[PDB]
Design a protein around this nucleic acid. Structure first.
Length: 79
RNA sequence: CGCGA
DNA sequence: TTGTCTTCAACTGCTTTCGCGATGCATGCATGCATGCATGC
């Protein structure tokens, strides 16, 4: 039934999806700027590209909820 | 062994 | 000693025409709750 060994993709897709879900709720409900999004695509882009420049079935991934919040804060603070 | 002459 | 018709008595066959109409016992999957094992971060 469920994917094997390269559900790394679905993992990063529920993760990415859940993040964008949170941004929808913070521009909408917390009256953030539209710019935040592009700031966030950049930071999560940077680290997505870094885990996909260390991507291997010998996998060492640690995307936690803490990572979501961490890139929101990270991006907010640049802004 | 139940239904019809 | 012996012949056999004598007698009672153990087996054994059928019955007016058509339509409407298996039991028990072992094996294992099923259900549910609680420990363990595998995936991921």
């Amino acid at each position: 039934k469920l994917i094997g060994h390269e559900a790394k993709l679905l993992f990063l897709k529920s993760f990415q999806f859940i993040l964008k879900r949170q941004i929808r709720w913070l521009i909408t409900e917390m009256r953030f700027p539209k710019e935040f999004e592009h700031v966030a695509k950049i930071i999560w882009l940077k680290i997505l590209k870094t885990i996909n420049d260390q991507p291997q079935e010998e996998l060492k991934l640690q995307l936690h909820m803490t990572s979501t919040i961490s890139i929101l804060y990270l991006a907010s603070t640049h802004l």
